[PDB]
C-alpha cells in the first residue's frame, strides 16, 4: 500500500513486476509464476 515512489501502484495481483533486468524473460503480462 501507498506505493508512492513514482510511476507505481498497489494491487493484489500477479507475481511479476516490470523489472529492467528481467524484461527479456518476464513482465507483468507475461509471467510464468502461477500462484
Amino acid at each position: 500500500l501507498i506505493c508512492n515512489g513514482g510511476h507505481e501502484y498497489y494491487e493484489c495481483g500477479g507475481a511479476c513486476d516490470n523489472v529492467c533486468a528481467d524484461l527479456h524473460i518476464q513482465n507483468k503480462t507475461n509471467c510464468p509464476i502461477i500462484n
Binding site: 500477479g14 502461477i34 500462484n35
Partner: protein, 316 residues
C-alpha cells in the same frame, strides 16, 4: 544424485514428526526414488535463484527449525503424487512420471507459493500473517495441480479460464487433503495462514463469501486485478464443487451431495478430456455434465447434482 534409497525422519512446519524418503551418497539428500522419476526438494537459502541446492543433510535427521519447510514440501509432494497415481491412474503431473521439484526458503518474508512451469516454490512467510507455506498439504497439492492443468487443459491464467484453473487447484488441493486424511476441510491454506488467528483461511470452498469471494455468477468480478479475478471468481466454481460433493441449499436451491470421490472423478475427466485453454464457466459446466454422463449415465443422480450445483451458483 545416485546413491542408496533411505528413510530419514524429521519434523514439519507444524511440529509433527514424519518419515521422508531420502538418498544417501556421502550426505542424505531429499531425493525420493520411490515415486516415478523422483521427488526432489531444494534449498533456495533466502535467495531467488532457482532451484537452489538439492537439500543435503549429514545424518538423515531433519529436526532443525530450518529443516521444517523442506520436510513438508518433500512429504506432501509425495502424498500428492500418490493421490494422482492411486485415484486417477496418473503418473506425476505430466502423466509420464516427470520429476517433481520443490524449493523452500525462497526469498525473505515471502507470503506466497507457486508453480513456475518447471517446479514448486514456497516462501517462508513473514511469520505473522503466514508461516512457511509448504506446511499446508492443500497448498502443496494446489501448486502441483497447476502443473497437471498445464499439461492437460492448458487453462489460460486469466479471466474465467484462469478462475477455472484456480478452482481446479483448490478442488484437487482439497481432495489430496482429504486423501491424506489428517485434518481435512473445505478451506484453503488454514494450516499456514495467520498463526495468531484460529478458524480462518485464505479461501473457503464451503462459503466463499466468508472472505469476500463471489458465491454466484451474478457477483462475478469483471475488472483486471488479479489477472481478471482468478483467485476471486474461483469462489463460484469452488462453491459448485463443494455442493456437488456435500450437498446443501444455496440461495434457495437444494443440491444432493454425491461425495468427494465422484466429484474428483467428474472433474478429473472434465480437465483431461473436455476443457481447453479458452474454456469459460459455461463450458466447464458442459464439461462436468458430459463427464458425469460418461461415467454415470444421463439419468444418474450424479448428472442431476452437477446440473443443480451449477444452477445454484448461476452458471448456465
Amino acid at each position: 544424485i545416485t546413491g542408496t534409497s533411505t528413510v530419514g525422519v524429521g519434523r514439519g512446519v507444524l511440529g509433527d514428526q514424519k518419515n521422508i524418503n531420502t538418498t544417501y551418497s556421502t550426505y542424505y539428500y531429499l531425493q525420493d526414488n520411490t515415486r516415478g522419476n523422483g521427488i526432489f526438494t531444494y534449498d533456495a537459502k533466502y535467495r531467488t535463484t532457482l532451484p537452489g541446492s538439492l537439500w543435503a543433510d549429514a545424518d538423515n535427521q531433519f529436526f532443525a527449525s530450518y529443516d521444517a519447510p523442506a520436510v513438508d514440501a518433500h512429504y506432501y509432494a509425495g502424498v500428492t503424487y500418490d493421490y494422482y497415481k492411486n485415484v486417477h491412474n496418473r503418473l506425476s503431473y505430466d502423466g509420464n512420471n516427470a520429476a517433481i521439484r520443490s524449493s523452500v526458503h525462497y526469498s525473505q518474508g515471502y507470503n506466497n507459493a507457486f508453480w513456475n512451469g518447471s517446479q514448486m516454490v514456497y516462501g517462508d512467510g513473514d511469520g505473522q500473517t503466514f508461516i512457511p507455506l509448504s506446511g499446508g498439504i492443500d497448498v502443496v497439492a494446489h501448486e502441483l495441480t497447476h502443473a497437471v492443468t498445464d499439461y492437460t487443459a492448458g487453462l489460460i491464467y486469466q479471466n474465467e479460464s484462469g478462475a477455472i484453473n484456480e478452482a481446479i487447484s483448490d478442488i484437487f488441493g482439497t481432495l489430496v487433503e482429504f486423501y491424506a486424511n489428517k485434518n481435512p476441510d473445505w478451506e484453503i491454506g488454514e494450516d499456514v495462514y495467520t498463526p495468531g488467528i484460529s478458524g480462518d483461511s485464505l479461501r473457503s470452498m464451503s462459503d466463499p463469501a466468508k472472505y469476500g469471494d463471489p458465491d454466484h455468477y451474478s457477483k462475478r468480478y469483471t475488472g483486471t486485478q488479479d489477472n481478471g479475478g482468478v483467485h476471486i471468481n474461483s469462489g463460484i466454481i469452488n462453491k459448485a464443487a463443494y455442493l456437488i460433493s456435500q450437498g446443501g441449499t444455496h440461495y434457495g436451491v437444494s443440491v444432493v451431495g454425491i461425495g468427494r470421490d465422484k466429484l474428483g472423478k467428474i472433474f478429473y475427466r472434465a480437465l483431461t478430456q473436455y476443457l481447453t485453454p479458452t474454456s469459460n464457466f459455461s463450458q466447464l459446466r458442459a464439461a462436468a455434465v458430459q463427464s458425469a454422463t460418461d461415467l454415470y449415465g444421463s439419468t444418474s443422480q450424479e448428472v442431476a447434482s452437477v446440473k443443480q450445483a451449477f444452477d445454484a451458483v448461476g452458471v448456465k
